[PDB]
Design a protein around this ligand. Structure first.
Ligand SMILES: [N-]=[N+]=NC[C@H]1O[C@@H](n2c(SCCCC(=O)O)nc3c(N)ncnc32)[C@H](O)[C@@H]1O
Length: 342
């Protein structure tokens, strides 16, 4: 078996000529030559079976990506694993090889307004499909947006996804931990479990702001600092928006703060397209019930050159693990991956 950087990467004989790419959320990522399709691909090594939580995330990722089929969502081309559960220690997921991701791109490249518009359109087109399946991604951020050499954009990593459950979204103050901090909506810290589609729209708004300036708009230094940054730009919430928060601890925290004025978007982004800033404002709206939804965002004037609802498909079959032991989850992963055996 081929090895990479002193570690088994057991993918042959179909996949050869391996090169290290990096260390992702699940393990080592390499490129490899696909001797059948005669193209180089990405291969991700996953070793989850010692821990129930790792098995949960791996099953979510595989189950969702196998059921979705969309141009703006990364597909699974192949899955490599041992022929029996007893011999299965690792799982390798094979995907199209993508030149870069939006995190790496923003480290060194200024985006044209035309690229910002195109990237945002593709993110929302993919998200429309995800939401139409009753699924929440719950970890949208630049490093989960892959790009190939012609700037085709694909959303990746569904290991933190959930089925939407808006009727059970309310919770208490300072208890919830959903999404990566900088992309986390204000209500997560106030009264929300992150079970509604508006959590994803907030993250897309954060990504849009970051595309406009190459810096994160709300760079909280730790969990508690994140709300300080959000309110420092949005300003104090209105009485109407506070009246929508029934939880007293959350509401009284906001009432205890000194008044803060809104910072106008065009002062933060003086070279931005004014239509982009109008859409940005609607995605970064404090009240999640007033926040724009994905189909409204696609129809916004900023995206008029691309908008075409008949070419913005939805899922055929929406989705309608907490307590399973890792042994049952391993068996489920084994069954989910059987179609690729051979
Ligand atoms: N940081 N880091 N290490 C991982 C390194 O892998 C890269 N990469 C990922 S991983 C995507 C996010 C979720 C995960 O972490 O699994 N998929 C890729 C793919 N299809 N094609 C090419 N490269 C990929 C990623 O662009 C980075 O260069």
């Amino acid at each position: 078996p081929e090895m990479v950087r002193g570690q088994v990467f057991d993918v042959g004989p179909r996949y050869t000529n391996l090169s290290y790419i990096g260390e992702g959320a699940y393990g080592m990522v390499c490129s490899a030559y696909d001797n059948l399709n005669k193209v180089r691909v990405a291969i991700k090594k996953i070793s989850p079976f010692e821990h129930q939580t790792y098995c949960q995330r791996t099953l979510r990722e595989i189950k969702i990506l196998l059921r979705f089929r969309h141009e703006n969502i990364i597909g699974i081309n192949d899955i490599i694993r041992a022929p029996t559960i007893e011999q299965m220690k690792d799982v390798y997921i094979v995907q199209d090889l993508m030149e870069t991701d939006l995190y790496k791109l923003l480290k060194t490249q200024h985006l044209s307004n035309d690229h910002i518009c195109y990237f945002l359109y593709q993110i929302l087109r993919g998200l429309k499909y995800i939401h139409s399946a009753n699924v929440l991604h719950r970890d949208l951020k630049p490093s989960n947006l892959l790009l190939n050499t012609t700037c085709d954009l694909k959303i990746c990593d569904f290991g933190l996804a959930r089925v939407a459950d808006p009727d059970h979204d309310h919770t208490g103050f300072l208890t919830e931990y959903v999404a990566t901090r900088w992309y986390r909506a204000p209500e997560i810290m106030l009264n929300s479990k992150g079970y509604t589609k508006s959590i994803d729209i907030w993250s897309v708004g954060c990504i849009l702001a970051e595309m406009l300036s190459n810096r994160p708009i709300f760079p909280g230094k730790h969990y508690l600092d994140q709300l300080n940054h959000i309110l420092g730009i949005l300003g104090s919430p209105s009485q109407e928006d506070l009246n929508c928060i029934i939880n007293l601890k959350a509401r009284n925290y906001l009432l205890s703060l000194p008044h803060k004025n809104k910072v106008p978007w065009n002062r933060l982004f003086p070279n931005a397209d004014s239509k982009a800033l109008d859409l940005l404002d609607k995605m970064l709206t404090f009240n999640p019930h007033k926040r724009i939804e994905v189909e409204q965002a696609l129809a916004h004037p900023y995206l008029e050159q691309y908008y075409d609802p008949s070419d913005e498909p939805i899922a055929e079959a929406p989705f309608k693990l907490d307590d399973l032991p890792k042994e049952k989850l391993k068996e489920l992963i084994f069954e989910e991956t059987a179609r690729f055996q051979p």
